[PDB]
Amino acid sequence: KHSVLHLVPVNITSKADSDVTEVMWQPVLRRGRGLEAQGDIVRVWDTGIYLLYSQVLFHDVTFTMGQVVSREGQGRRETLFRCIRSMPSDPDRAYNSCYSAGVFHLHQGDIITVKIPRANAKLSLSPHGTFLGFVKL
Amino acid sequence: KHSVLHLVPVNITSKADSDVTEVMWQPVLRRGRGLEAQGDIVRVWDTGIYLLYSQVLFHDVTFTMGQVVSREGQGRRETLFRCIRSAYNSCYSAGVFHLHQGDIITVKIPRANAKLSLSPHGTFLGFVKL
Amino acid sequence: KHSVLHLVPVNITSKADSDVTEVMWQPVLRRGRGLEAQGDIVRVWDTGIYLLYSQVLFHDVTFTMGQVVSREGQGRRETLFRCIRSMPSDPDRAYNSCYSAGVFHLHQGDIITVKIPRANAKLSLSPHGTFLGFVKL
């Protein structure tokens, strides 16, 4: 039976003079031990091929938002995929979700990140609006 | 072999909405018998972990729309995932969830008389047991 | 171990009087031989049930936009799924990734196309923004 992990937000973080916002994740479903949430990143322990999906629900008013999913490993940062979505100007209509997913080879030791490249991004903590998960294939 | 069900619309529903618009679903691809379409709902007969995806293609032009995918089991109703958006506009989302025998799955658009497309390649619903 | 294919864009074909734009793909992740990328289309050699996903990032503004994923097989073309957005009013608010995916029975001898139904559509060739993939289930 395949290893899987579905994660939802506990809170959002944004370092001082960075222009980055990330999510502190918590597991709500887990089978197997190939994956482990460790705060705002997810560590891979079992080398192999994984379906990886990300949704973020944005409430920002700025031109465009979108999250970047990348894998740190082997001295590199590699971008796996990115979701881009344009935002309305009207602020009471800023409720837009961005879903992307793909299949990628991950090695044990790799760190997976989900970054939104603005500071203090207005991201929903709602577990059904913003989430992240994994299925070993 | 993984159990699967891929479903496409046959119709929408009734005037007075209770603030919701729904879809009658027709299976066009199946493997295994642990999932069953019962009109506007899908029943889960085999407890397990499932990929569940949903797309809805809107013709409408209002506030926000999007769809709410939920499960109701022994006692309690629970939102699994949602797609939100602000003349043709598709809204896709998906996730992996633990579904229980006896579960009713619903896909509800939370507005009255939403104009939804019945194109089987614009609005659809699916399950893969993992 | 399930067969898989993650593909990224090498180029865009678009015939002078055809109203359509296609993507030439190349695999960056491959397991098994049941699928074969070929010019602007993917051939299916191993009959089965497949998860298929597609994202396109559009450079275009002022165009109602999205992609069509289809198969040709036993005599006739068939639309599997599409993604669609209205991407008009404001040109500074145009960028949107369009993602869709589904599970489909593919037959040996099937060609899989991703098409944008407009002449000379401007797409990002970015492998993080535009991609196609397959997982046999």
Written overview of the protein:
- The structure is a homotrimer.
- Chain A has no helices and twelve strands.
- Chain A has 137 residues and is an all-beta fold.
- In chain A, the strands form two sheets. In chain A, strands 1, 2, 3, 4, 5, 7, 8, 10, 11 and 12 form a ten-stranded antiparallel beta sheet that branches. Chain A has a two-stranded antiparallel sheet with strand order 6-9.
- In chain A, a hairpin with a 7-residue loop joins strand 1 and strand 2 (21-31).
- The first copy, chain A, is globular, with a radius of gyration of 15 Å.
- Chains in contact: A-B, A-C, B-C.
- The interface between A and C is medium-sized, with 26 and 25 residues.
- It is classed as cytokine, hormone/growth factor.
Q: What labels would you give this structure?
A:
homotrimer; 137 residues; mainly beta; Jelly Rolls; ten-stranded antiparallel beta sheet; two-stranded antiparallel ribbon; 12 strands; 58% strand; globular; secreted (chain B); disulfide bond (chain B); Tumor necrosis factor ligand superfamily member 13 (chain B); glycoprotein (chain B)
Q: In sequence order, what are the helices and strands of chain A, one letter per element?
A: EEEEEEEEEEEE
Oligomer: homotrimer
Q: Please report the distance between the alpha carbons of the first and last residues of chain A.
A: 10 Å
CATH architecture descriptor of chain A: Sandwich
**Structural class of the helix and strand makeup of chain A?**
mainly beta
Question: Helix segment count of chain A?
Answer: 0
Largest interface: A-C, 26 and 25 residues
- Compute the CA-based radius of gyration of chain A: 15 Å
Helix fraction of chain A? Answer: under 10%
Q: How would you describe the shape of chain A?
A: globular
The proportion of strand residues of chain A reads over 45%
Strand tally of chain A, please? Answer: 12
Query: What characterizes the major β-sheet of chain A?
Result: 10 strands, antiparallel
Domain tally of chain A: 1
Q: In the CATH hierarchy, what is the class of chain A?
A: Mainly Beta
For this structure, the CATH topology of chain A is Jelly Rolls
Main location (chain B): secreted
Disulfide bonds (chain B): 83-91
Subcellular location (chain B): Secreted
Function (chain B): Cytokine that binds to TNFRSF13B/TACI and to TNFRSF17/BCMA. Plays a role in the regulation of tumor cell growth. May be involved in monocyte/macrophage-mediated immunological processes.
